[PDB]
Each structure stands twice: as structure tokens, then as C-alpha cells.
Amino acid sequence: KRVDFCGKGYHLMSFPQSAPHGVVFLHVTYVPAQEKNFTTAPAICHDGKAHFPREGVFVSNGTHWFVTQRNFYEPQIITTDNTFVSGNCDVVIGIVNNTVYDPLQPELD
Amino acid sequence: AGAALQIPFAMQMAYRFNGIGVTQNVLYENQKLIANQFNSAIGKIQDSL
Ligand SMILES: *[C@@H]1O[C@H](CO)[C@@H](O[C@@H]2O[C@H](CO)[C@@H](O)[C@H](O)[C@H]2NC(C)=O)[C@H](O)[C@H]1NC(C)=O
Ligand SMILES: *[C@@H]1O[C@H](CO)[C@@H](O[C@@H]2O[C@H](CO)[C@@H](O)[C@H](O)[C@H]2NC(C)=O)[C@H](O)[C@H]1NC(C)=O
Ligand SMILES: *[C@@H]1O[C@H](CO)[C@@H](O[C@@H]2O[C@H](CO)[C@@H](O)[C@H](O)[C@H]2NC(C)=O)[C@H](O)[C@H]1NC(C)=O
Ligand SMILES: *[C@@H]1O[C@H](CO)[C@@H](O[C@@H]2O[C@H](CO)[C@@H](O)[C@H](O)[C@H]2NC(C)=O)[C@H](O)[C@H]1NC(C)=O
Ligand SMILES: *[C@@H]1O[C@H](CO)[C@@H](O)[C@H](O)[C@H]1NC(C)=O
Numbered sequence: 001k002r003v004d005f006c007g008k009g010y011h012l013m014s015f016p017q018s019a020p021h022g023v024v025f026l027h028v029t030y031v032p033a034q035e036k037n038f039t040t041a042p043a044i045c046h047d048g049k050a051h052f053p054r055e056g057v058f059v060s061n062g063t064h065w066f067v068t069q070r071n072f073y074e075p076q077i078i079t080t081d082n083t084f085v086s087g088n089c090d091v092v093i094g095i096v097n098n099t100v101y102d103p104l105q106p107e108l109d
Numbered sequence: 110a111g112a113a114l115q116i117p118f119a120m121q122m123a124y125r126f127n128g129i130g131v132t133q134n135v136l137y138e139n140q141k142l143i144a145n146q147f148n149s150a151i152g153k154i155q156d157s158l
Contacts, residue, residue: 032111042123091137
């Protein structure tokens with residue numbers, strides 16, 4: 001996890017080869033590509049409660065809000081298993097209104 | 110690690126709080142105090158210099 005100790009990018013793995021009086025390291029790394037821009041927010045307010053992502057960021061495609069993982073764009077809908085709650089929505093700078101979906105009660109019809 | 114991708118600075122500070130074991134609500138609920146403390150700490154360096 002040391003930055004730039006095993007090449008440029010996120011180190012995946014490395015292979016050694018012998019040279020005359022030396023060694024050659026072939027570093028395999030992961031390099032992110034083809035980014036898009038989005039709107040973002042730190043928390044989400046629902047029922048007077050602030051919701052934070054468990055892992056990921058809240059992003060908006062223009063009209064809807066999703067959670068994604070931070071390094072590869074893979075959007076999902078914001079549920080109570082995606083997030084955790086802390087406090088009320090009066091203290092966070094930049095909080096946004098949206099609905100956080102519960103699975104249990106629409107299972108219970 | 111590649112191309113520069115923008116992110117707002119308080120959200121970068123929250124990632125970094127996660128990286129030491131503190132949840133990020135602790136940053137967002139203290140943002141103003143944390144920024145005051147950083148500013149006083151930076152203002153103390155030029156005084157010693
Ligand atoms: C943002 O993504 C959503 C996808 O959830 C698009 O909204 C539509 O949402 C309904 C119900 O959620 C789906 O049945 C549709 O298939 C979605 N797409 C369309 C084209 O109707 C929404 O269009 C996206 N917004 C932008 C600006 O890209
Ligand atoms: C990001 O910065 C913009 C300014 O560029 C902020 O927008 C202003 O919001 C205030 C309310 O606090 C309004 O009175 C101003 O009229 C807005 N200005 C513009 C140019 O839109 C925005 O609130 C900031 N975002 C956050 C999360 O603080
Ligand atoms: C997000 O939703 C909340 C919930 O209603 C909004 O809070 C209201 O804000 C208006 C204007 O600031 C007040 O007149 C109401 O009294 C508030 N309602 C409650 C129940 O407190 C909040 O304004 C919404 N945020 C945005 C940006 O529209
Ligand atoms: C955590 O520590 C900080 C000290 O940096 C406290 O904030 C200070 O509180 C004193 C009260 O004695 C104020 O006079 C200062 O102005 C505060 N500093 C800043 C930068 O706001 C804070 O109260 C402490 N929190 C708790 C829960 O004890
Ligand atoms: C994102 O938008 C900015 C302008 O706000 C633009 O300069 C940048 O090239 C865009 N990047 C992508 C991936 O769309």
C-alpha cells in the first residue's frame with residue numbers, strides 16, 4: 001500500500017526476473033480510466049435524520065441519488081443497509097433531501 | 110495514481126478520517142472546529158519561523 005514503491009497506480013502484483021548482476025521487477029498495477037463528473041453530497045436527510053454512506057459516496061446523475069463505491073462507478077439505490085444514521089439534519093454543511101428505502105416494511109405489505 | 114479527479118475538500122478530509130479509524134460523521138459534525146484548529150496550527154508555524 002506504499003505509494004509508488006511498486007510502480008505507478010494501485011499495486012496488484014509483481015514478478016521478478018534475473019539480469020546480469022541485477023534484478024528486474026515487472027510491476028502489475030491498476031490504473032483508473034474514463035471518468036465522469038457527478039453532483040455529490042456528504043449526507044442525506046430523511047425523517048429528520050442524517051444518513052451517511054457505509055462505504056461509497058452519494059452521487060447524483062442529474063435527478064436521482066445513488067451510492068457508489070469510490071473507485072469504480074457502480075450505482076445502487078440508497079437503503080438502510082447502504083447507510084448508517086447519526087444525529088439530525090441541522091449540523092452538516094451541504095446536506096440534501098432524499099428518501100432512504102427500507103426493505104422490511106415493503107416486504108410486510 | 111492516474112488522472113486528477115476532483116472531490117470537495119471536506120469530503121476528502123472525511124475519507125482521511127476514515128483512513129485512521131474514525132467515522133466520518135465525526136468530521137462532518139465538527140467541521141468548523143477542525144478547520145479553526147488547522148488554521149491556528151498553520152498560523153503558529155510562521156510565527157516560529
Ligand atoms: C438517472 O438515472 C435514472 C435511473 O434510475 C433515470 O430515471 C428513470 O427511472 C425510472 C424509474 O426509476 C426507470 O424506469 C427508467 O428506466 C430510468 N431512465 C429513463 C430514461 O427513464 C434517469 O433518466 C437518469 N437521469 C439522467 C439525467 O440521466
Ligand atoms: C458552494 O458555493 C456556492 C457559491 O458559489 C454556494 O451557493 C450559495 O449559497 C448561498 C446559501 O448559503 C446563497 O445565498 C448564494 O446565493 C449561493 N451562491 C451561488 C453563486 O449560488 C453553495 O451553498 C456552496 N455549497 C455548500 C455545500 O456550502
Ligand atoms: C429538506 O426537507 C426539510 C424537511 O421539510 C426542509 O425543512 C423545511 O425547511 C423550510 C425552509 O427552510 C421550513 O420552512 C420548514 O419549516 C422545514 N420543515 C421542517 C419539518 O423542519 C428543508 O428546507 C429541505 N431542504 C431544502 C433544500 O429544500
Ligand atoms: C474539544 O476541545 C476544543 C479545544 O480545541 C474545545 O473547543 C474550545 O472550547 C473552549 C471552551 O473552554 C472555547 O473557549 C474555545 O473557543 C474552543 N475552541 C474552538 C476552536 O472552538 C471543545 O469545546 C472541546 N469539546 C468537548 C466536547 O470538550
Ligand atoms: C467535468 O466538468 C468540468 C467542467 O465543470 C470539465 O472541465 C471536465 O472536463 C469534465 N470532466 C468529465 C469527465 O466530464
